[PDB]
Amino acid sequence: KFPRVKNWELGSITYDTLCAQSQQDGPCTPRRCLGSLVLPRAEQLLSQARDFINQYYSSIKRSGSQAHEERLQEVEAEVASTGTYHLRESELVFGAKQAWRNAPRCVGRIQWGKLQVFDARDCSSAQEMFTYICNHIKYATNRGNLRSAITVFPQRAPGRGDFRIWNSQLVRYAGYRQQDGSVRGDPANVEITELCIQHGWTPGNGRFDVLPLLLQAPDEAPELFVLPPELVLEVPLEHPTLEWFAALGLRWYALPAVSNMLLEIGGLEFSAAPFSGWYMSTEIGTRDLCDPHRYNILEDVAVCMDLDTRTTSSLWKDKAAVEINLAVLHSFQLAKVTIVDHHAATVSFMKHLDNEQKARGGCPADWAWIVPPISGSLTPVFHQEMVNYILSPAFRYQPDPW
Amino acid sequence: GPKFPRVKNWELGSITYDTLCAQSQQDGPCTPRRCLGSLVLPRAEQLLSQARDFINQYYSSIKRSGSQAHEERLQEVEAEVASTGTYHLRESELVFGAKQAWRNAPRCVGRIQWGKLQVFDARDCSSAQEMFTYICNHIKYATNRGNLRSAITVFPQRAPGRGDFRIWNSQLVRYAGYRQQDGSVRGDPANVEITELCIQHGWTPGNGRFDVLPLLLQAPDEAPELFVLPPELVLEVPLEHPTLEWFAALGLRWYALPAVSNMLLEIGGLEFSAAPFSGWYMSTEIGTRDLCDPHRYNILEDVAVCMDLDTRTTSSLWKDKAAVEINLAVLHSFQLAKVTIVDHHAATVSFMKHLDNEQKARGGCPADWAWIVPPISGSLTPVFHQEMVNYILSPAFRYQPDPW
Numbered sequence: 001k002f003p004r005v006k007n008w009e010l011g012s013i014t015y016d017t018l019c020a021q022s023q024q025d026g027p028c029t030p031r032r033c034l035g036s037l038v039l040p041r042a043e044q045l046l047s048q049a050r051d052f053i054n055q056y057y058s059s060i061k062r063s064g065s066q067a068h069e070e071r072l073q074e075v076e077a078e079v080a081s082t083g084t085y086h087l088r089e090s091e092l093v094f095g096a097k098q099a100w101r102n103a104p105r106c107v108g109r110i111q112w113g114k115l116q117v118f119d120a121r122d123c124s125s126a127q128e129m130f131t132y133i134c135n136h137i138k139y140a141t142n143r144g145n146l147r148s149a150i151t152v153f154p155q156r157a158p159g160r161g162d163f164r165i166w167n168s169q170l171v172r173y174a175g176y177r178q179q180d181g182s183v184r185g186d187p188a189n190v191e192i193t194e195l196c197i198q199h200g201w202t203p204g205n206g207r208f209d210v211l212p213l214l215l216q217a218p219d220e221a222p223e224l225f226v227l228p229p230e231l232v233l234e235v236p237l238e239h240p241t242l243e244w245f246a247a248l249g250l251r252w253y254a255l256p257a258v259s260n261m262l263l264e265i266g267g268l269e270f271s272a273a274p275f276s277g278w279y280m281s282t283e284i285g286t287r288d289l290c291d292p293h294r295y296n297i298l299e300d301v302a303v304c305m306d307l308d309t310r311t312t313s314s315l316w317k318d319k320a321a322v323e324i325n326l327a328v329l330h331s332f333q334l335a336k337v338t339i340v341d342h343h344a345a346t347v348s349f350m351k352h353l354d355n356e357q358k359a360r361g362g363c364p365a366d367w368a369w370i371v372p373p374i375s376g377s378l379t380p381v382f383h384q385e386m387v388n389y390i391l392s393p394a395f396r397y398q399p400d401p402w
Numbered sequence: 403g404p405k406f407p408r409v410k411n412w413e414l415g416s417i418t419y420d421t422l423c424a425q426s427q428q429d430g431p432c433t434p435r436r437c438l439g440s441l442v443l444p445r446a447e448q449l450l451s452q453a454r455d456f457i458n459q460y461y462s463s464i465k466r467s468g469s470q471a472h473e474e475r476l477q478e479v480e481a482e483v484a485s486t487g488t489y490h491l492r493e494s495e496l497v498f499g500a501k502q503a504w505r506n507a508p509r510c511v512g513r514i515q516w517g518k519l520q521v522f523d524a525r526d527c528s529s530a531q532e533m534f535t536y537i538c539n540h541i542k543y544a545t546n547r548g549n550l551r552s553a554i555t556v557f558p559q560r561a562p563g564r565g566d567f568r569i570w571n572s573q574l575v576r577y578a579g580y581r582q583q584d585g586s587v588r589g590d591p592a593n594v595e596i597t598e599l600c601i602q603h604g605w606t607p608g609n610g611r612f613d614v615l616p617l618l619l620q621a622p623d624e625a626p627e628l629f630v631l632p633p634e635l636v637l638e639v640p641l642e643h644p645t646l647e648w649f650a651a652l653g654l655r656w657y658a659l660p661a662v663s664n665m666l667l668e669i670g671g672l673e674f675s676a677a678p679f680s681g682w683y684m685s686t687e688i689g690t691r692d693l694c695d696p697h698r699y700n701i702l703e704d705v706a707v708c709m710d711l712d713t714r715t716t717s718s719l720w721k722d723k724a725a726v727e728i729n730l731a732v733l734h735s736f737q738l739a740k741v742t743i744v745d746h747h748a749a750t751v752s753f754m755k756h757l758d759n760e761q762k763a764r765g766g767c768p769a770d771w772a773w774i775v776p777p778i779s780g781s782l783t784p785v786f787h788q789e790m791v792n793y794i795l796s797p798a799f800r801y802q803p804d805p806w
């Protein structure tokens with residue numbers, strides 16, 4: 001009923017009691033575990049709303065108070081009359097932080113209480129979305145001293161189409177399918193790149209061309225907006241000891257800003273609610289730059305290092321990957337842009353686990369995502385058993401809107 | 403697609419559906435409420451149904467399903483259970499079952515080799531002395547002077563009201579761990595308990611970092627007996643680095659033969675409590691887990707100091723750099739000593755081939771992602787990008803709690 005959770009490095013044991021609060025089923029059954037899958041495939045609104053309002057008044061230590069009773073009344077009155085309701089700004093702020101706190105795949109949750117929430121629910125056009133997005137980027141970037149933020153656009157409504165940001169992140173690089181079937185730039189972005197061109201964008205021809213935004217107001221075709229280049233902070237990549245590295249012309253953007261996820265609070269759904277923090281370096285150094293289906297630079301770098309590329313057992317991939325990760329860290333540090341390495345991040349996540357154990361009796365965590373893509377067992381999270389489950393408020397993946 | 407789990411590879415975009423999971427007769431620890439896939443230890447009518455299922459599997463495998471020989475074997479199994487409470491496997495049934503248990507092991511990345519397993523039948527064993535003889539024969543055969551051969555030796559099954567055959571050691575070859583006066587451990591901290599148990603049963607201990615442990619072998623209803631492995635039987639590899647000349651001076655070594663000895667082999671409801679098996683190492687297990695785990699030999703800082711890395715800060719990636727060179731030293735040293743070993747890149751490549759093989763042969767492959775993905779360089783290997791479905795099939799290897 002309550003899972004025992006063991007840490008194999010230290011021998012310590014906890015019991016996860018928080019999982020009993022989960023009201024949403026995941027993909028696993030007693031017959032088979034599907035934990036490694038990336039996307040597994042009024043009365044109800046009212047109970048989700050009540051539970052959320054209960055969570056909110058409990059957080060400000062006012063459970064059972066007058067304000068608590070009357071707010072529940074307002075919610076019931078609104079839902080009974082209209083089939084929906086609306087959150088107060090303070091409730092939205094609480095809800096956004098809780099969705100972050102609840103996110104099982106996020107190693108950065110020690111920071112969960114520190115989040116700037118921009119209320120963009122008064123947005124009525126793709127143009128207004130753009131202005132809000134520009135302000136988010138400026139605030140969050142803060143000349144390299146990154147600040148966590150989320151901008152929340154109008155909720156879904158039974159009648160109409162969603163507000164949507166078509167881009168999966170606010171800042172990404174284009175991928176241009178070449179004549180010879182190869183890709184120039186980021187192969188993950190060929191489709192969105194093609195959509196932008198088809199919506200009137202004049203493309204670059206570089207490996208690191210910042211994509212325009214396609215923003216969608218309800219039941220309208222998406223509209224194209226180019227980010228002012230001064231707003232988009234980038235970091236040229238150099239290596240502390242390998243001089244030829246800077247000459248690879250590699251770079252990455254400062255701000256990791258996820259724009260494709262749905263934010264669910266109290267049964268209400270925010271289909272556009274882009275959020276940003278700061279990078280953990282292995283994501284750039286390992287996944288973005290070294291994934292075979294991404295920039296795939298591993299062999300290039302290894303040849304520059306004069307490593308024997310002919311055989312796996314020289315561990316040329318492992319050596320090149322480490323140096324690339326080092327270059328990312330050195331470069332962001334040099335440019336004075338907030339970044340965290342995987343050792344520091346996982347140490348802080350272990351602290352987060354302990355804090356949550358005391359605060360809530362557990363912490364939903366997805367081990368496959370929490371353990372970094374290099375040097376897994378070198379981090380403390382590798383030796384930590386984790387219990388995974390869905391708590392609400394929650395961030396939810398939504399498929400590309402085309 | 404159908405009502406079976408959809409399984410995606412994110413590097414290649416390819417999709418399969420796992421239909422094999424329908425064959426699972428045993429619950430794992432997950433529910434719709436919560437996933438427990440990352441936990442190491444998951445929390446006569448019965449016998450006969452497991453037996454029938456296994457016999458059905460055996461006759462399917464030899465293409466005689468529904469035949470007279472198949473029906474007669476089922477009747478023979480039932481009549482034996484009816485009169486004795488148990489039954490016994492034929493030689494070829496044991497061979498099939500042991501191979502199938504390996505094939506079915508979700509945590510094993512080496513399964514491309516599953517059909518090549520030398521099965522030693524030791525079901526005639528009747529004393530701890532004879533267990534020792536069988537184990538020495540296994541080690542000699544498996545080691546083969548460095549040209550390693552996969553093998554399993556199967557001792558008699560669990561029986562009603564009679565004690566088990568048990569090997570107390572978790573592996574046939576492990577190093578001692580000696581608790582020091584200052585609280586530190588000399589040798590392998592993982593083995594402190596077994597080391598102290600060996601001393602209690604009359605072993606004169608060494609005082610090195612790499613002292614091979616004796617075996618504690620238990621025959622039915624007896625105290626375990628102590629047996630020292632003759633040193634000429636235990637092949638070891640001194641560790642050196644191809645370019646860093648000081649590495650050899652560290653005096654590190656590892657043994658050639660990974661031989662797991664504490665797992666239970668379950669076949670058709672029969673339980674083989676002693677059935678040690680062995681293959682060859684994947685290099686990251688030694689280089690990363692055995693040598694670099696904080697709770698094991700913990701040599702990362704030592705090696706990083708020798709490499710002159712800045713160990714005072716995480717962002718120098720000193721742990722990552724040292725771990726890579728230690729892993730390279732292991733591969734290099736085993737290759738130099740002509741002892742079979744496989745790197746994590748070659749092993750995960752072969753496992754992807756295995757997945758494709760099993761997709762065609764059985765419609766899926768149970769696999770534990772957290773164990774298949776190696777402990778360094780995870781996403782540099784193809785298995786990181788492959789979704790995996792985990793479920794329990796029988797025949798199976800199951801973990802056994804220490805007999806103490």
Ligand code: HEM
Nearest residue numbers: 100103105106107108111148149275276277278279280395
């Ligand atoms: C402040 C610094 C932060 C760090 C270092 C961090 C770190 C990470 C990392 C490494 C991942 C896995 C990324 C991947 O491989 O795709 C992740 C995922 C995630 N993070 Fe955090 N994060 C931070 C801030 C935030 C914020 C501000 C939010 C929302 C308010 C958030 C919510 C999420 C969610 C929902 C995921 C899963 C995303 C997905 O499914 O693609 N994180 N984070």
Ligand code: HEM
Nearest residue numbers: 504507509510511512515552553679680681682683684799
């Ligand atoms: C032939 C070369 C082999 C290779 C390269 C290999 C590789 C591996 C690796 C890397 C692991 C994870 C070990 C750990 O981290 O503790 C593992 C586990 C396992 N292997 Fe294989 N293996 C091989 C042969 C075998 C054989 C012959 C058997 C049995 C017949 C077997 C059955 C298992 C089982 C049952 C586990 C899980 C053990 C546990 O739960 O502690 N493997 N293997």
Ligand SMILES: Cc1cc(N)nc(C[C@@H]2CNC[C@@H]2OCCNCCc2cccc(F)c2)c1
Nearest residue numbers: 038039169256257258275276277278279280397
């Ligand atoms: C198919 C699919 C499902 C899903 N849940 N998610 C995705 C995004 C993928 C996950 N892996 C790569 C890519 O995500 C890339 C974006 N990752 C940034 C995470 C981050 C880091 C620091 C601060 C933040 F605010 C956010 C795709």
Ligand SMILES: Cc1cc(N)nc(C[C@@H]2CNC[C@@H]2OCCNCCc2cccc(F)c2)c1
Nearest residue numbers: 442443573660661662679680681682683684801
């Ligand atoms: C508690 C517990 C549960 C469990 N299932 N397992 C264990 C042994 C642990 C697993 N992780 C480290 C240690 O096992 C160390 C032994 N692993 C050798 C694997 C191997 C490699 C090549 C060929 C083979 F035939 C076998 C402990």
Ligand SMILES: C[C@H](O)[C@H](O)[C@H]1CNc2nc(N)[nH]c(=O)c2N1
Nearest residue numbers: 036037038368369786787788789
């Ligand atoms: C198939 C597998 O689940 C998939 O490759 C996951 C593994 N772990 C991950 N972990 C993080 N942090 N981000 C990812 O995109 C992934 N991908």
Ligand SMILES: C[C@H](O)[C@H](O)[C@H]1CNc2nc(N)[nH]c(=O)c2N1
Nearest residue numbers: 382383384385440441442772773
């Ligand atoms: C907590 C976690 O499940 C545990 O540390 C696992 C992770 N993956 C592993 N994978 C392998 N191959 N061997 C192990 O011992 C472990 N340990």
Ligand SMILES: [Zn+2]
Nearest residue numbers: 028033432437
């Ligand atoms: Zn699961």
